[PDB]
Amino acid sequence: ADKKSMDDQEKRSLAEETGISLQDLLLEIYRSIGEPDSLYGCGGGKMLQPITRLRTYEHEAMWGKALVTYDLETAIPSSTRQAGIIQALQNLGLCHILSVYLKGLDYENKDWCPELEELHYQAAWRNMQWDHCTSVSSYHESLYNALQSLRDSTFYESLKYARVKEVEEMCKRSLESVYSLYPTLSRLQAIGELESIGELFSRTHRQLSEVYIKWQKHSQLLKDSDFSFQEPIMALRTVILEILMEKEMDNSQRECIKDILTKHLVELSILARTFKNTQLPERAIFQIKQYNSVSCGVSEWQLEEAQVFWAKKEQSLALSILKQMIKKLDASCAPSLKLTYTECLRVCGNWLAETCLENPAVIMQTYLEKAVEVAGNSDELRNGKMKAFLSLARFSDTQYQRIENYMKSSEFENKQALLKRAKERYTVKVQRELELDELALRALKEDRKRFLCKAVENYINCLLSGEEHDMWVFRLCSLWLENSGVSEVNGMMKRDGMKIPTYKFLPLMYQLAARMGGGLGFHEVLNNLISRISMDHPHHTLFIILALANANRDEFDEDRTEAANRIICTIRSRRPQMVRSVEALCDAYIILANLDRKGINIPADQPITKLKNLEDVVVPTMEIKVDHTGEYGNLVTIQSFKAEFRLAGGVNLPKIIDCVGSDGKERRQLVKGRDDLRQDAVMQQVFQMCNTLLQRNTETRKRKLTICTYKVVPLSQRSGVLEWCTGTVPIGEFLVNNEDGAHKRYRPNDFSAFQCQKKMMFEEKYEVFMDVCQNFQPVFRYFCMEKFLDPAIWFEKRLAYTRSVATSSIVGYILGLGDRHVQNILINEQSAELVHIDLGVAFEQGKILPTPETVPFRLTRDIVDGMGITGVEGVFRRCCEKTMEVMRNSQETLLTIVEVLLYDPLFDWTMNPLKALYLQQRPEDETELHIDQSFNKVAERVLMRLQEKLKGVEEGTVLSVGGQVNLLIQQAIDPKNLSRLFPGWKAWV
């Protein structure tokens, strides 16, 4: 490619033949690679309708379309394959069908019986358990053998006879390039299950449960899964049941425990729900139905059919049956499965939430009845109870939110009603029901004081009841904030605040204190609890607590908070540590921060901070050091700080400051004044929470992507606490290397300055930009590639980097990101990764820019960097879709403290600030050349823009992302947007 590119470059300079076939082959190599977006959308470029269309449809997981394609692929050769595909499709699709396809497999020709028989064996390995053994007129064949061989003994032998015969395939397997090794490993992992069997033919059932529990442990082990991979694993794990039914029919409890197997199968179906694939997931029920899970007294079977709520994609076929259960089962409810029933009721309520159909009162009956079923109420139940009290909250929250909307949203209506509050007359007319309207407004409050009250408890209850909603708690917290200082049930919430898993509760901290030091019965009481919380992992609590004052403290309005910070300092006095010498050290750091001016790598940190004031001797120490626990307080110290810290140049310059911990690990620290951290910072916490949310997406784990989080600290109101870590983008300097490097002989940064000298104008700028583009050739693909080595890495890391490049790249428009530059965003090939560093800009602050513009805004070279190919959205979007999906997934919870986010006392950043945002932070001092409600409204607008962002388009189209991506792509695309740029991204010029 580079060769072709160079060749192209040469050909340009001059200004599989054409090798898109090679690219296809490379795609085929990308296929040979088999990397899913690199397969899918990064494999995108290949002009399918070849069977590539099928292969695409095959790349597509979707049997039917493929099956249709496979059907359409009657046109194509390898119809045997297409049949096998169809088989796979049938495998994907269905069974008696496949039996009919086994009938379809009559088929008269024996060659790919090598598949087909094995597939017939796989069909045995599917079904007709000992029957298809009779039908035997390969792993499957082995299984098929093993199948009857199961009916035994020397299956164990035969298993071995397969086992390495399998491993033979593994032996046969070569070049080590991918998983599906995994599938083999699965086919292996299969064998293990198969192997695992033999105890049974030997074999109590109680023990066997452990094996199920082991199979479950294996399933737990299989928490890492690919349904495709997992399919057999279950299928076997299921198929395990087959004679495990047959023989263990003998033992009733065993025949019973098949229920647990069914339950497992159900769980498998639950996993199928997880797999988010219909067919066996249905058939499972059928199987379950087919099973003695036909029997269905308590219909935990059907309780599974809560699958069918979305498993029939439509509920209410099901939800009716659920309702039927939720009647009949509730009627059947009319022992501990009562919890399940309650859970069912919760599920019913959930399904009723899923209903989103009858009165909240219906829920506030049925779900409140489900809540009464919750009142019908292990930790799982508690989790369920959380899941309930959460749903209970959530539902009430919904109602409350609806109420909140109906309050606040319909406050505008209530304004429209306040427009009618006394409308203008007749005293018999205007004045009367305003009392009721007040009572309504009271009811409106009382609705919150119903719902918001109830949920809060439920939230609290759920919050108490366990983990994983914590963001929604942060919303409930955000609610509790709206409640905080109000709604003395907040004090009751404070009274409920006994239940705080402060360890859980911790995250709020950066926000949490924002008001902590007004309302005594709340904020102080909260602050009290906060302090109480602060005590918990006070080490964790420290820096905010440290920041709490030290944000504003100076050795050279609502500071009652700062007073409360002293009152905290009393709690901090109550901390024996008196480690606040650290704060003094921070002040010494602030002094160090105060210190200032010979540009260079700079020795002589000595004068300041008492030369690191005993060199950061070990203490309640190791500041930067992000981790914390519920157990937290077993830690490391700071024990050295290397002085003479080479000055990191900057407007507020740092020194690269590496303080060697108790570990002596010396983390080069980013410290510069005139600096507000939390404004940047909690965005990280958000991004962290996002990453957590990302983490919260195993889909993101499936994406295997994440967010890049700077660890900084809120040192001073005007300064400073961070770690300047690694390898960041001096991309332009990298260009200044690489522009000087392979991009040598293109057009200067001066020409770019000449481009920057195009700042006058406007379409000419596009032309200029076009010229600038013509003047430039984003080599950055070549760039980190050069940085790259280990062509694995230089692919994979490159991919990873690309993935990395993509990885946050999604977040930005979602994020409402800051400025373009290798300064205004960074990347460490040190990290072999890109952490965009600005964290300046509010979501729309960039839109609020004079010379605003919009995109995730990777430049061409940044694209070229982002990927040297692929319309990398083809991956990146395909990746970033998940983000949107996750975003879409998270949206409400996403909003949740995201709501709280701009609600901060610190949130003037979230206000996209003034001084023209410091002259747009002196928007390069303009190239060194040239309403809280409204904020809330803007925030609402943001929230709208968020609601726009979160499932909305400009059209409200929202056109999940790929359109928005296409939009983003468009947003990325525009030479106009390019023309729309200013120096920071006119850098990108």
Next chain:
Amino acid sequence: ADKKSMDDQEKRSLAEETGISLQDLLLEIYRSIGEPDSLYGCGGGKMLQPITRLRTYEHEAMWGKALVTYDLETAIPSSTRQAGIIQALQNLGLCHILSVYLKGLDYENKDWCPELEELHYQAAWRNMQWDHCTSVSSYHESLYNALQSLRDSTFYESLKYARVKEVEEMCKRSLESVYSLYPTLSRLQAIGELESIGELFSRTHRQLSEVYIKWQKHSQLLKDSDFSFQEPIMALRTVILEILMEKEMDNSQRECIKDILTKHLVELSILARTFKNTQLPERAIFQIKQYNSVSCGVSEWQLEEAQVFWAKKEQSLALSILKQMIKKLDASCAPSLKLTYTECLRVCGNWLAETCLENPAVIMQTYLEKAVEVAGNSDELRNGKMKAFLSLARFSDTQYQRIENYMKSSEFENKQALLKRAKERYTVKVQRELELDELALRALKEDRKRFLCKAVENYINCLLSGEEHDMWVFRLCSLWLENSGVSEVNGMMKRDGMKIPTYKFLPLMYQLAARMGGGLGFHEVLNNLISRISMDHPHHTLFIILALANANRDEFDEDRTEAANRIICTIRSRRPQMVR
């Protein structure tokens, strides 16, 4: 029910046992009725997962789920039926599959071969045209017979031998409660097509086109349709092509005209698009592809694959191929199919609208190029030109609307920008680009004056170019109203107002006059045109015109309008009727 209700009422007053089974039976009677919502959601109440779930899934048109259900319906008896269902599903679903299901129909048991063979015949009646005739080892069976009998002659006899043998079913049909009589009538209407054949075995091709055109007329006749019903109708109408391919391979133009048949098939696929059902609609392409509509120089075949834009539900697999066409075909474009190509370009623009992806400028290239392809430009084309100028309007309208939004919606942003209009200082700061912002606002206007202007013409052009957007015209009118009294291109629109199909233009009337009597160059000029329009079907125009004053007139502010109403009354004087 009332009895039960009365019984209930009585039981209340007192205050299929329980007969929801009866209700189910009544549903089954509603089924016996067969009225779709009365079937479907009004049939809703019956507690399915019986095969009712299937029957529901069967009520559901959706093969796969049903097929899945049918698959799940391996559980159920009448698996033969479920198979037949599967067959129907396969019929709904697919073919080599059904062939595989014909393989699946190996199946060892002959009873519902009475279906299956007939279905195999229906599979013949599906496919393996003279081949499944060989596979014969019923309407379909008749067809299957007719199939080879087509290979002839006494098929015509055999047809009769079916024809009333069919009508026998009709005779057998009794109680007259529903269509599907229609399906029989279709199965009959089928026969007609089958009957219609015989001229061919006798048979020019030019004439035959009329029969296609007749089949099209029939299709026009089939404008009333149920895809379910229509399915065979097409399928036959398609299947008609089968030997119509085979024999008429002999005559090249005939072999060619199979393109028109393909075109018909394509139209059938278009109808399939209309049917809004994927499978054969795909297979059609495959068939088309399988056809000499494999050949694909101008890819009107692919121009159909604009199906695949949503026919692959996702475009851009296709739209890429479309783009590929819209490159390659546009490259191939680089004769009158140029209109189609333009239409394609329009479609491309439409697909580009469907893209909703790159710059409006991209459209304002590509679609404007499509508009240039529109400029590349019968009445259909004019309709297309409308469809273009409409899309052209619509796209611009979108842009203009976007502009309108970006104007008016972003007027709030422009208010947020007016908040920055002079923000508060530095005279080097606050004052500068407001001029550009004005120029932007100008550009914003100029955007409308690009888009709103362009669309308006396109709207006008489309408005001129024909019917059926008229509401969108009413929007363009509504736009023209925003334009009215403004945007002297409105006067140019008035100048364009020459094109008014006032008869079309009529509907606005109740609104239309609302301002008609301010801006002379517009409202009056409009009122003039309105009057001019009013002259058109002045009888229609009358009462509003009558109302125009008589709303307010009393024998016991902007009445310049009422004056204009008198000025209209002058035009009404210009009406000799003096019917006033």
